[PDB]
Ligand SMILES: OC[C@H](Cc1ccoc1)Nc1ncnc2[nH]ccc12
């Protein structure tokens with residue numbers, strides 16, 4: 001039993017809700033919130049901009065030190081950093097950004113990072129301003145993640161479309 005509430009159950013392990021991931025994380029304070037990161041951990045827009053703003057820029061300060069020490073992530077890769085006031089940990093995951101010409105096949109690799117964590121609050125990787133098809137992102141999520149994932153979908157018409165089109 002966990003404190004996630006109001007989710008629709010899609011499979012044994014994947015749950016979905018129309019929600020603002022910032023407000024969800026503040027309420028649940030989950031063990032892991034997933035950020036839709038880029039390789040530079042520059043949290044400017046989309047989910048990343050919103051999560052960073054909610055931390056009063058502490059996420060960005062921590063991220064800049066991480067990059068100065070370790071260099072950029074790989075597309076498809078991840079790192080675990082602090083969750084600040086939102087969660088215990090933030091798993092920064094880099095899905096391919098179609099608006100940069102990156103390979104959509106890397107989306108499965110990106111979702112594989114979720115399997116290192118028993119329970120996660122997450123957005124759909126490569127959706128929104130990353131330019132991929134969200135119906136496709138949900139399919140890859142369901143077919144790749146085996147741990148318990150609670151997906152927050154920001155857009156209401158998209159949430160309804162994702163539910164009604166889910167196989
Ligand atoms: O796939 C990630 C989606 C993309 C999208 C599609 C339509 O609008 C946004 N973004 C988000 N999902 C959940 N919580 C969020 N908080 C701020 C942004 C955000």
Ligand SMILES: [Cl-]
Nearest residue numbers: 046047128129
């Ligand atoms: Cl977005």
